[PDB]
Design a binder for this molecule. Structure first.
Ligand SMILES: CCCCCCCCCCCCCCCCCC(=O)OC[C@H](COP(=O)([O-])OCC[N+](C)(C)C)OC(=O)CCCCCCCCCCCCCCCCC
Ligand SMILES: CCCCCCCCCCCCCCCCCC(=O)OC[C@H](COP(=O)([O-])OCC[N+](C)(C)C)OC(=O)CCCCCCCCCCCCCCCCC
Ligand SMILES: CCCCCCCCCCCCCCCCCC(=O)OC[C@H](COP(=O)(O)OCCN)OC(=O)CCCCCCCCCCCCCCCCC
Ligand SMILES: NC(=O)[C@@H]1CCCN([C@@H]2O[C@H](COP(=O)(O)OP(=O)(O)OC[C@H]3O[C@@H](n4cnc5c(N)ncnc54)[C@H](OP(=O)(O)O)[C@@H]3O)[C@@H](O)[C@H]2O)C1
Ligand SMILES: CCCCCCCCCCCC(=O)OC[C@H](COP(=O)(O)OCC[N+](C)(C)C)OC(=O)CCCCCCCCCCC
Ligand code: SF4
Ligand code: SF4
Ligand code: SF4
Ligand SMILES: [Zn+2]
Lengths: 207, 176, 48, 156, 116, 335, 96
């Protein structure tokens, strides 16, 4: 074989492709796209209205039994109308398999909280609101989790500066820690690392 | 394969029940614990007599940064900024210009030892073994400014520790 | 070092110095680059 | 005996008492606390120098800031410094406490615990080895050994 | 379909204004407790003026969804103050007591530096 | 001059303000606010200190890296003064002690030391020089503290003619000895006073107001060779002022008269302590001295500072004196 | 080597020295200015020009893999020597 190239597993790829169609046939109302990657990962892309139907089916259906929410996060892609892409990574212990479910929202459109399906989603959705600003409807207790109290903005957005807008310091006149506009003794040095030559022809986007 | 850690059924015969009754009333398993601490009292402690004895290290130890020279005294650094580009913490600031004799050399080489994570990526990325992490780990200061190294400080560290840096590199360059 | 002494080089320190922090011999950082922008010096003779 | 001789000796006695009984309060915030625990472990045994393992904030003489100090945590670090009886010294352990470290440019990180509290010793490393931290503590003892409070008072 | 946007809480500005006044009433009555619990040096009048000023900034909004988020954020901010999750530093960051006044006119900005 | 220090930045911690200041006596009550304000705007501050370095640790956080430099100096060593000012563009003299020691008396700290600092600064080429006198300085006053203030204020005006002299009233603040002084008398039963506090009028000023006046006098070219008088916005009788202090502190107020000669006898007893005396014969004279009115001198309003009333910030100072609203005292209308 | 300026301050191998009127000289008061006494520019000038008998020569800086990337230097010009771009050693072609 080739010592340095990752071996392929066509059996898992075929199995996940068949199961992707299986879900798409059972939830046409919501599924918008299904794809399987070259390393055997299945992604189900759905309408944001189908969060509770699709996740509930995947958790409870006998042939799915995805009873674990491994991770719930979001990605900011400012070029899209709906900036944020909400990603649910699920694990099935019954079938020793994983599935990824993706939806989308924007700054003002809320998404239905997944706490009714998976209790683990409670703190993951608090982090998405805190870092990305996506609002989850009917969340039992939604509020900042990671950032400081009174922190303005949502750091993990692509238009939020790396060092933020304010910085802390102890002032002896007021005898407390104060917040002032950020000044850096050394500015972060922006490196332009991209190579002007195409690396992967297989992903060439048509002009 | 798997195994159960706590799935035993305590035998309920009279002898076994009385064995547990003696354990409860006579504190047998608690005294068994005192035996273990008593034994440690009579072992030799593992403490070393610092600073008169020092903990063992290896040639690969990543300590204080330093700038080296060739056997002639010429600086090894030729201002290529690979250490600056790789440094994950952006702790290295470099400026360079053609020297008086026309050589490619730095006019500034600062390592903010308070941004540095002592990762060693600088000594890996250097193609002339100029910047290294020496074996000194005792250079704590009394002020924050003393940890902002410039080229003069880094060259002095190289001249200071060249006797030990060279022997460490000699003992490890074949693994690199 | 008595059995395998280090390689000798002219630039290596002959006298080793311990940690000098907190003493007058301590290191003080400074910029090692010369001035960048040369400012205009006005003429020293009156224009009129 | 001259007054300058009695005061010189009293300084040594109180300096000796204070540097021989340094009880530290450790702010274990991040990985540097694990190396701080290795200084208390049998290998180095900080306790044999007179440095008790764990001391309450109202009994401590030195605060060891061992780990990243974030904005959210900075107010509580100052609150513990203000409640520490004097003399009180502060030791900054690691790059994160020193000057921000790996996370210098983060929106949520205090770029050095020395802009929240005064610092007496800076221990460099990510993390400093248990021996490099013990060097800082022993370096703080020598700093306390050079104090001349009574001598300076006698010349006012 | 372009403007057929899912709401958060309010279906029109009339409902959104209802939540704002309820939020304003909650803040108005809380200031005397905040000035007492946190031992602030400001007065109740100054605290309520800041509450008033904060509401006035977002008075030009006409999108109910945007108003819903401002009320959602406002309630979250109020929750931190009521439950004493904030500290005196967080409550006093609305007043900018250590930031020297910055000039607003052209000439004063012209002397100090280059920022417009 | 090839160029000044050319301020850069936004005026924050990491900016460059162009001020290189040698603040003498920066380890006291007034100094810890001057360094704080100079450091907040990014100024190189040299802090000559006579004390142990442990007592200057509260200043280190006030400036960015390298913006605060600590040097040793002796009040009677002109060479040490020269080392601290020869690179500065402004020298601020805050040296002052409210009691006489075995080694330094009111003549040394208020005449000789200010004059030595002023002379060396002129020789070294220092441009700005700010000297802090007292408002009630008078060569014919019962307080040796105030008499030496007048003598020293005159020699500074001679050695360094282009010197800005600030003449503030009693300053009240967190670390003051004016409002904290009218709170430690409760430990002795009652609050003894001369003439029951009547016949004495005081016009205290806030520490930050004095601090902003000094900062604005450094940056104001129209302050060279000018004598300022920093006073508060209201005048109070010494009786109603002290009554207000005890009302903010919620402590019993039992003011009783005490003859002047007896107040001196108790004052002498407290002078035997080798530490900061609780009260000295000189302090009692100043507390009961009446704040002068000098309309010809400029004040805070000229430098651009609005004097802060004592009512908005008496709670700040006196919060620590409470155990486990208050009516403002009676002001004195300007005729 | 280190040559002091007219104010008592040493000039570093990069030519940096604070002007007489610069306020930044204050940081050295009571302390010292760290300057490295071994100027590399002068030291590399003490190395003799190696005489070789071929058009092209190779330099790795000495020590094999402990030196610098091996480069090949051309010696066709008789007016000047062949200088290594990394270590500064100079080479000359013997009488041709
Ligand atoms: C210093 C000089 C050296 C001697 C110092 C004294 C040493 C005492 C501690 C030794 C511990 C040895 C370990 C050991 O044998 O314990 C295991 C043994 C057995 O522990 P076990 O629980 O594992 O025994 C298993 C059997 N069954 C289930 C029945 C318990 O401990 C004992 O047998 C001690 C029981 C007697 C304790 C009665 C105390 C009464 C109080 C009298 C005060 C005097
Ligand atoms: C009982 C409690 C109340 C006691 C009241 C005071 C009376 C007891 C005094 C006891 C003196 C202990 C001092 C011992 C110092 C010592 O052992 O050496 C440490 C040190 C040893 O060196 P070192 O401690 O600096 O270094 C330690 C590190 N190694 C291990 C590597 C060496 O010796 C000194 O130089 C310290 C000088 C102390 C001088 C004290 C003089 C006092 C004279 C009496 C004054 C009047 C008394 C009132
Ligand atoms: C004494 C030794 C003899 C003995 O105890 O009998 C042993 C006999 C064999 O054991 P086994 O087969 O388990 O019988 C019990 C089944 N029910 O077991 C027996 O059948 C004996 C009779 C069973 C009931 C015995 C109850 C003993 C516990 C009662 C409390 C005794 C407290 C004594 C004081 C304690 C303080 C020292
Ligand atoms: N505090 C007030 O109410 C008033 C009212 C009007 C005028 N003043 C004068 O302003 C100067 C500042 O005084 P202060 O800061 O308020 O009070 P102090 O704590 O005493 O500060 C004195 C500093 O000067 C140092 N100092 C005193 N004596 C000496 C000396 N012989 N040699 C060197 N320094 C001396 C002192 O240092 P240290 O002893 O604490 O280490 C302080 O730093 C003052 O002139 C007022 O009269 C304020
Ligand atoms: C009672 C509390 C202790 C009083 C100490 C004292 O006052 O001791 C004084 C004597 C010296 O006498 P002096 O030169 O008058 O010092 C008076 C104090 N000064 C110099 C600060 C003005 O100190 C000694 O010789 C050593 C004391 C240990
Ligand atoms: S050890 Fe790593 S972080 Fe430190 S200077 Fe070298 S490359 Fe940068
Ligand atoms: S130290 Fe090495 S990697 Fe860094 S600039 Fe110099 S030659 Fe390049
Ligand atoms: S300095 Fe290094 S070890 Fe210490 S907290 Fe920061 S990253 Fe962790
Ligand atoms: Zn070479």
């Amino acid at each position: 074989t080739r010592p340095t190239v990752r071996p392929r597993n066509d059996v898992a790829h075929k199995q996940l492709s068949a199961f992707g169609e299986y879900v798409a046939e059972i939830l046409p109302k919501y599924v918008q796209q299904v794809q399987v990657s070259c390393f055997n990962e299945l992604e189900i892309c759905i309408h944001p209205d189908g969060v509770i139907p699709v996740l509930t089916f995947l958790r409870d259906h006998s042939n799915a039994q995805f009873k674990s929410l491994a991770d719930l996060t979001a990605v900011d892609i400012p070029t899209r109308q709906n900036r944020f892409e909400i990603v649910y990574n699920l694990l099935s212990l019954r079938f020793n398999s994983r599935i990824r479910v993706k939806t989308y929202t924007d700054e003002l459109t809320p998404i239905e909280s997944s706490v009714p399906v998976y209790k683990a989603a409670n703190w993951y959705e608090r982090e998405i609101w805190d870092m990305f600003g996506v609002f989850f409807a009917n969340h039992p207790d939604l509020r900042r989790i990671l950032t400081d109290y009174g922190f303005e903005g949502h750091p993990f957005r692509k238009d939020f500066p790396l060092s933020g807008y304010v910085e802390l310091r102890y002032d002896d006149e007021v005898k407390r820690v104060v917040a002032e506009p950020v000044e850096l003794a050394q500015e972060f040095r922006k490196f332009d690392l991209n190579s002007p030559w195409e690396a992967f022809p297989a992903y060439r986007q048509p002009p | 394969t798997y195994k159960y850690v706590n799935l035993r059924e305590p035998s309920m015969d009279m002898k076994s029940v009385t064995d547990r009754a003696a354990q409860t009333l006579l504190w047998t398993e608690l005294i068994r614990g005192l035996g273990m601490t008593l034994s440690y009292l009579f072992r030799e402690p593992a403490t070393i007599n610092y600073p008169f004895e020092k903990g063992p290290l290896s040639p690969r130890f990543r300590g204080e940064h330093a700038l080296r020279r060739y056997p002639s005294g010429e600086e090894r650094c030729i201002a290529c900024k690979l250490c600056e580009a790789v440094c994950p913490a952006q702790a290295i600031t470099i400026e360079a210009e053609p020297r008086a004799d026309g050589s490619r050399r730095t006019t500034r080489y600062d390592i903010d030892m308070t941004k540095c994570i002592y990762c060693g990526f600088c000594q890996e990325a250097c193609p002339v073994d100029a910047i290294v992490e020496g074996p000194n780990f005792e250079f704590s200061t009394e002020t924050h400014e003393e940890l902002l190294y410039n080229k003069e400080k880094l060259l002095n560290n190289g001249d200071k520790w060249e006797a030990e840096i060279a022997a460490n590199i000699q003992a490890d360059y074949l693994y690199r | 070092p008595t059995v395998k002494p280090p390689t000798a080089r002219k630039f290596i320190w002959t006298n080793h110095k311990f940690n000098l922090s907190g003493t007058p011999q301590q290191y003080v950082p400074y910029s090692t680059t010369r001035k960048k922008i040369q400012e205009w010096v006005p003429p020293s003779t009156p224009y009129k | 005996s001259r007054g300058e001789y009695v005061v010189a000796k009293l300084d040594d006695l109180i300096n000796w008492a204070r540097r021989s009984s340094l009880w530290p309060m450790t702010f274990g915030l991040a990985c540097c606390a694990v190396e701080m625990m290795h200084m208390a472990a049998p290998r180095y045994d900080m306790d044999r120098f007179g440095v008790v393992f764990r001391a309450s904030p109202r009994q401590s003489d030195v605060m060891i800031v061992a780990g990243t100090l974030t904005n959210k945590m900075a107010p509580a670090l100052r609150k513990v410094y203000d409640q520490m009886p004097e003399p009180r010294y502060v030791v900054s352990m690691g790059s994160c406490a020193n000057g921000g470290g790996y996370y210098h440019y983060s929106y949520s990180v205090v770029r050095g615990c020395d802009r929240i509290v005064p610092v007496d010793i800076y221990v460099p490393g990510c993390p400093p080895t248990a021996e490099a931290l013990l060097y800082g503590i022993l370096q703080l003892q020598k700093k306390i050994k050079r104090e001349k409070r009574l001598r300076i008072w006698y010349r006012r | 379909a372009s403007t057929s946007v899912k709401p958060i809480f309010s279906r029109d500005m009339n409902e959104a204004k209802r939540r704002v006044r309820e939020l304003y009433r909650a803040w108005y009555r809380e200031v005397p407790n905040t000035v007492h619990l946190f031992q602030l040096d400001i007065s109740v009048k100054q605290g309520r003026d800041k509450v008033r000023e904060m509401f006035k900034k977002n008075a030009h909004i006409t999108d109910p969804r945007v108003v819903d988020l401002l009320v959602i954020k406002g309630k979250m901010e109020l929750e931190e103050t009521i439950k004493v999750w904030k500290q005196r530093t967080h409550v006093m960051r609305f007043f900018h007591e250590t930031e020297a006044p910055r000039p607003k006119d052209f000439l004063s900005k012209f002397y100090v530096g280059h920022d417009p | 001059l090839h160029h000044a220090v050319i301020p850069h930045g936004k005026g924050g911690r990491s900016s460059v303000s162009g001020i290189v200041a040698t603040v003498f006596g920066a380890t006291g009550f007034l100094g810890r606010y001057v360094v704080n304000h100079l450091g907040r705007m990014g100024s190189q501050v040299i802090v000559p200190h006579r004390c142990e370095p442990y007592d200057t640790m509260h200043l280190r956080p006030m400036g960015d890296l390298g913006q605060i430099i600590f040097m040793d100096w002796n009040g009677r060593d002109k060479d040490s003064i020269r080392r601290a000012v020869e690179h500065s563009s402004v020298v601020i003299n805050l040296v002052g002690r409210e009691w006489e020691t075995q080694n330094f008396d009111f003549e040394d700290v208020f005449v000789k030391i200010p004059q030595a600092i002023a002379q060396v600064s002129k020789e070294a080429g220092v441009e700005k020089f700010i000297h802090i006198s007292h408002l009630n300085a008078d060569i014919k006053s019962s307080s040796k503290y105030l008499r030496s203030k007048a003598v020293g204020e005159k020699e500074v005006r001679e050695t360094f003619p282009e010197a800005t002299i600030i003449k503030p009233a009693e300053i009240f603040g967190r670390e003051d000895r004016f409002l904290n002084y009218f709170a430690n008398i409760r430990w002795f039963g009652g609050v003894p006073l001369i003439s029951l506090g009547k016949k004495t009028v005081k016009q205290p000023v806030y520490i930050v107001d004095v601090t902003k006046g000094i900062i604005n006098a450094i940056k104001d070219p129209d302050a060279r060779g000018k004598t300022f008088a920093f006073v508060g916005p209201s005048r109070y009788l010494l009786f109603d002022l002290v009554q207000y202090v005890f009302a903010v502190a919620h402590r019993p107020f039992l003011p009783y008269p005490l003859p002047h000669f007896a107040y001196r006898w108790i004052g002498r007893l407290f002078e035997i302590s080798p530490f900061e005396p609780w009260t000295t014969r000189d302090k009692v004279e100043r507390i009961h001295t009446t704040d002068k009115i000098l309309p010809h001198l400029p004040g805070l309003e000229d430098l651009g500072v609005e004097a802060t009333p004592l009512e908005l910030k008496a709670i700040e100072v006196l919060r620590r004196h409470r155990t486990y609203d208050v009516q403002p005292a009676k002001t004195i209308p300007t005729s | 080597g280190v040559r002091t300026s007219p104010t008592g301050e040493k000039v570093t191998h990069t030519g940096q020295v604070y002007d007489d009127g610069d306020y930044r000289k204050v940081r050295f008061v009571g302390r010292q200015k760290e300057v490295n006494e071994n100027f590399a520019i002068d030291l590399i000038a003490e190395q003799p020009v190696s005489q070789v008998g071929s058009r092209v020569i190779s330099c790795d800086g000495g020590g094999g893999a402990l030196g610098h990337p091996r480069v090949y230097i051309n010696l066709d010009k008789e007016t000047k020597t062949g200088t290594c771009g990394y270590c500064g050693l100079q080479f000359r072609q013997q009488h041709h």
